[PDB]
């Protein structure tokens, strides 16, 4: 279904943004360990 495809597309784009934020947080934690 097209609606399901669009919903999962926007959800996975949000996941991409969240997980690149997680990656940069992981890079930040190296400075403090």
Coordinates of N, CA, C and O in Angstrom, one line a residue:
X1 N 0.8 -1.2 0.0 CA 0.0 0.0 0.0 C 0.9 1.3 0.0 O 1.9 1.3 0.7
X2 N 0.4 2.3 -0.8 CA 1.2 3.5 -0.9 C 1.3 4.2 0.4 O 2.3 4.8 0.8
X3 N 0.2 4.3 1.2 CA 0.2 4.9 2.5 C 1.2 4.3 3.4 O 1.9 5.0 4.1
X4 N 1.2 3.0 3.5 CA 2.1 2.3 4.4 C 3.6 2.6 3.9 O 4.5 2.8 4.8
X5 N 3.8 2.6 2.6 CA 5.2 2.9 2.1 C 5.6 4.3 2.5 O 6.7 4.5 3.0
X6 N 4.7 5.3 2.4 CA 5.1 6.7 2.8 C 5.3 6.8 4.3 O 6.2 7.5 4.7
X7 N 4.4 6.1 5.1 CA 4.6 6.1 6.5 C 5.9 5.5 7.0 O 6.7 6.1 7.8
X8 N 6.3 4.4 6.4 CA 7.6 3.8 6.7 C 8.7 4.6 6.2 O 9.8 4.6 6.8
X9 N 8.6 5.3 5.1 CA 9.6 6.1 4.5 C 9.9 7.3 5.5 O 11.1 7.5 5.8
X10 N 8.9 8.0 5.9 CA 9.1 9.1 6.9 C 9.6 8.6 8.2 O 10.5 9.2 8.8
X11 N 9.1 7.4 8.7 CA 9.6 6.8 9.9 C 11.1 6.5 9.8 O 11.9 6.7 10.8
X12 N 11.5 5.9 8.7 CA 12.9 5.5 8.5 C 13.8 6.7 8.3 O 15.0 6.7 8.7
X13 N 13.3 7.8 7.7 CA 14.1 9.0 7.6 C 14.3 9.6 9.0 O 15.4 10.0 9.4
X14 N 13.3 9.6 9.9 CA 13.4 10.0 11.3 C 14.4 9.1 12.0 O 15.2 9.5 12.8
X15 N 14.4 7.8 11.7 CA 15.4 6.9 12.3 C 16.8 7.2 11.8 O 17.7 7.1 12.6
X16 N 17.0 7.6 10.6 CA 18.3 8.0 10.1 C 18.8 9.2 10.8 O 19.9 9.2 11.3
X17 N 17.9 10.2 11.0 CA 18.3 11.4 11.7 C 18.7 11.0 13.2 O 19.7 11.5 13.7
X18 N 17.8 10.3 13.9 CA 18.1 9.9 15.2 C 19.4 9.1 15.4 O 20.1 9.3 16.3
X19 N 19.7 8.3 14.4 CA 20.8 7.4 14.6 C 22.1 8.1 14.2 O 23.2 7.8 14.8
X20 N 22.1 9.0 13.3 CA 23.3 9.9 13.1 C 23.5 10.8 14.3 O 24.7 11.0 14.7
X21 N 22.4 11.2 15.0 CA 22.6 11.9 16.2 C 23.2 11.0 17.3 O 24.1 11.4 18.0
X22 N 22.8 9.7 17.3 CA 23.4 8.8 18.2 C 24.9 8.6 17.9 O 25.7 8.5 18.8
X23 N 25.2 8.5 16.6 CA 26.6 8.4 16.2 C 27.5 9.6 16.7 O 28.6 9.4 17.2
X24 N 27.0 10.8 16.5 CA 27.7 12.0 17.0 C 27.8 12.0 18.5 O 28.9 12.4 19.0
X25 N 26.8 11.6 19.2 CA 26.9 11.5 20.7 C 28.0 10.5 21.1 O 28.7 10.7 22.0
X26 N 28.0 9.3 20.3 CA 29.0 8.3 20.6 C 30.4 8.9 20.4 O 31.4 8.6 21.1
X27 N 30.6 9.7 19.3 CA 31.9 10.4 19.1 C 32.2 11.3 20.2 O 33.4 11.5 20.6
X28 N 31.2 12.0 20.8 CA 31.4 13.0 21.9 C 31.9 12.3 23.1 O 32.7 12.8 23.9
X29 N 31.3 11.1 23.4 CA 31.6 10.4 24.7 C 33.1 10.0 24.8 O 33.6 9.8 25.9
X30 N 33.7 9.8 23.6 CA 35.1 9.4 23.6 C 36.0 10.4 24.3 O 37.0 10.1 24.9
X31 N 35.6 11.7 24.2 CA 36.4 12.8 24.8 C 36.4 12.7 26.3 O 37.3 13.1 27.0
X32 N 35.3 12.1 26.9 CA 35.2 12.1 28.4 C 35.5 10.8 29.0 O 35.7 10.8 30.2
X33 N 35.6 9.7 28.3 CA 35.8 8.4 28.9 C 37.1 8.4 29.7 O 37.2 7.9 30.8

